[PDB]
């Protein structure tokens, strides 16, 4: 009776989102879908136990099976090293997976009509296309302990030349230094994914850089997008009455703030990280956002919950206190992954299921059933009473009941 779901790579995560991830599988996915599930535990304890090998194994499994669904994980700092008794301050697992797979992370707010926007003018959606490779996420940074020279060198593989640039001569005291890079092929794939997303939505595209300051580094992103546009997409954009334009990043954030939305925003890795959280919050709620890595092969995706592990709710949970955490982004990581799986397999039943679960999630919140964090968006936290929201278990039960109803009606809807 269960839908034959196919092959999916799942990555378990940390703290509150790890608890929610299990509730999602048990209450919303497993009762209706049978999967060939390849499970990787990306919990901080397991990454520590495997010396972060589990992260690389999960990335390789996504390349093989073409669809990954990831739970929010901890990127450890000094406090986490103390808390979990870690061997090393492990690198971000999202950075590791994105650097192995490459591509563009597409992010968009999840809209509920009853959640007020913080930016009045935003009547149409904004889609951010965050370049998922290189820059700060594959950088080499270090503390400069004292006086001395920091230089950056380039040596072509033919061995016939060497270029050395002085970064800084630390004359007195120390500081910090770093090197970072990006690859032309990765930038070209980011450009193609951005232009294709704009044509698919029928919306204009904007790329943001600071090419007036980083004339070579950001200039390369600006030049690659302009060349690909002029040679491969200008006529298709003109036919659809849309356009592509480059903007300086500081100008772009201000223009986005005063716009009515309805555009694709190509962001470099760091800007995509920052501005996707600004835009998600602007639409009403930080936790109400989809995030899907679209790989350059045009076949592989990794859907994820881009927010944190909700440590404050997890601490309350550990103390036996009632908690009320928004599971919607975690649900949409599953639905977006399952919708892609269904498209690859031409599986109509799975495609219907993935869409129905998204509809149920939105319909439940719009009917006034939600978690404390969302109820606070509507009423303001000092005005929220216990009767205004459902705890995490009650909310998951309500979604499960509504999903069973939607699926039962869809089965009855079928012409004999």
Ligand X SMILES: *[C@H]1[C@@H](C#N)C(=O)[C@@H](C)[C@@H]2CCc3cnc(Nc4ccccc4)nc3[C@@]12c1cccc(C(=O)O)c1
Q: Which of residues 349-388 bind ligand X (CB under 6 A)?
A: 372-373, 376, 381
142 interacts with, out of Ca ion, ligand X, its own copies, none, CB within 5 to 8 A per kind:
its own copies
Least separation in angstroms between CB 95 and its own copies: 7
Determine contact, residues 10/37, Cβ cutoff 8 Å. yes
- Kindly list the distances between the CA atom of residue 272 and the CA atoms of 9, 221, 280, in Å, as whole numbers in the listed order: 25, 14, 12
Q: How far apart are CA 17 and CA 293, in angstroms?
A: 19
The verdict on 208 binding ligand X (CB under 6 A) reads no
Among 53, 183, 200, 318, binds its own copies (CB under 8 A): 183
Using the rule CB under 8 A, give the single segment among 6-14, 206-214, 342-350, 358-366 that binds its own copies.
206-214
Please report how close the Cβ of residue 291 comes to Ca ion at its closest, in angstroms: 9
Alpha carbons 323 and 23: distance in angstroms, whole number: 14
Question: Binding of ligand X at residue 69 (CB under 6 A)?
Answer: no
The residue written with tokens 């992260």 in the block is: 55
Q: How many CA atoms lie within 13 A of 342 on its CB side?
A: 18
Smallest distance, ligand X to C-beta of residue 289, A:
9
Whether 11 contacts 64, CB under 8 Å: no
For position 79 contacting its own copies by CB under 8 A, the verdict is: no
Positions 248 through 307 that interact with Ca ion (CB under 5 A)? 250, 273
The torsion angles phi and psi of 106, rounded to 5 degrees, stand at -90, 125
Using the Cα atoms of residue 185, residue 187, residue 241 and residue 262 in order, give the sign of their dihedral.
positive
- Asked if 235 is part of the footprint of its own copies (rule: CB under 8 A), the reply reads no
State the binding string over 289-328 for ligand X (x if CB under 6 A, else -).
Answer: ------------------x--x-xx---------xxxx--
> How remote is the C-alpha of 289 from its chain's centroid?
8
- 286 near ligand X, judged by CB under 6 A: yes
Q: Does 41 bind ligand X (CB under 6 A)?
A: no
The size of the interface with Ca ion (CB under 5 A), counted in residues, is 2
Range in contact with its own copies (rule: CB under 8 A) among 29-37, 39-47, 254-262, 333-341: 254-262
**Of the residues 30, 46, 84, 138, which one makes contact with its own copies according to CB under 8 A:** 138
Q: Shortest approach of Ca ion to residue 274 CB, angstroms? A: 7
301-304: strand order across its sheet: 33-41, 3-12, 67-70, 301-304, 289-294, 104-109, 126-131, 263-267, 205-209, 244-248
Strands 126-131 and 104-109: antiparallel
What does the radius of gyration of the chain's CA atoms come to, in whole angstroms?
A: 23
For the chain, the first-to-last Cα distance in angstroms comes to: 17
Q: Count residues contacting its own copies (CB under 8 A)?
A: 88
In the list 4, 181, 200, 298, the residue contacting its own copies (rule: CB under 8 A) is: 181
Q: To the nearest whole angstrom, how small is the minimum distance from the Cβ of residue 310 to ligand X? A: 5
Q: Rounded to whole angstroms, how far apart are CA atoms 168 and 255?
A: 35
52 is in an annotated binding site: no
In the complex, the smallest distance separating the C-beta of residue 376 from ligand X, rounded to whole angstroms, is 4
The residues that touch Ca ion, with contacts defined as CB under 5 A, are: 250, 273
Output the known binding site for substrate: 75, 92-98, 107, 130, 210
């Amino acid at each position: 009776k269960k839908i034959s779901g196919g092959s999916v790579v799942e990555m378990q995560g940390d703290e509150m989102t790890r608890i929610i991830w299990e509730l999602i599988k048990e209450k919303l996915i497993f009762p209706y879908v049978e999967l060939d599930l390849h499970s990787y535990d990306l919990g901080i304890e397991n990454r520590d136990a495997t010396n972060d090998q589990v992260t690389k194994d999960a990335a390789e499994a996504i390349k093989k099976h073409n669809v990954g669904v990831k739970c929010a994980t901890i990127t450890p700092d000094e406090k986490r090293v103390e808390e979990f008794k870690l061997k090393q301050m492990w690198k971000s697992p999202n950075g590791t997976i994105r650097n192995i797979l490459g591509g563009t992370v597409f992010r968009e707010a999840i809209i509920c009509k009853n959640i007020p926007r913080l930016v009045s003018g935003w009547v149409k959606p904004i889609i951010i296309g965050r370049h998922a490779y290189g820059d700060q996420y594959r950088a080499t940074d270090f503390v400069v302990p004292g006086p001395g020279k920091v230089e950056i060198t380039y040596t072509p593989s033919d061995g016939t030349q060497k270029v050395t640039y002085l970064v800084h001569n630390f004359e007195e005291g120390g500081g910090v230094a770093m090197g970072m890079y990006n690859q032309d092929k990765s930038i070209e794939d980011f450009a193609h994914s951005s232009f294709q997303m704009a044509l698919s939505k029928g919306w204009p595209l904007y790329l943001s850089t600071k090419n007036t300051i980083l004339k070579k580094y950001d200039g390369r992103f600006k030049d690659i997008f302009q060349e690909i546009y002029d040679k491969q997409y200008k006529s298709q954009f003109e036919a659809q009455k849309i356009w592509y334009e480059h903007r300086l990043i500081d100008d772009m954030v201000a223009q986005a703030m005063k716009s009515e939305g309805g555009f694709i925003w190509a962001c470099k890795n760091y800007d995509g990280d920052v501005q996707s959280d600004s835009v998600a919050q602007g639409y009403g709620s930080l936790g109400m956002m989809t995030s899907v890595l679209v790989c350059p092969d045009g076949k592989t995706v990794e859907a994820e919950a881009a927010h944190g592990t909700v440590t404050r709710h997890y601490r309350m949970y550990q103390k036996g206190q009632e908690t009320s955490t928004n599971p919607i982004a975690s649900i949409f990581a599953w639905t977006r992954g399952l919708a892609h799986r269904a498209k690859l397999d031409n599986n109509k039943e799975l495609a219907f299921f993935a869409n129905a679960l998204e509809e149920v999630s939105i319909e439940t919140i719009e009917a006034g059933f939600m978690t404390k964090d969302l109820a606070a968006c509507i009423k303001g936290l000092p005005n929220v009473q216990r009767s205004d929201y459902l705890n995490t278990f009650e909310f998951m039960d309500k979604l499960g009941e509504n999903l069973k109803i939607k699926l039962a009606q869809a089965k009855l809807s079928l012409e004999h």
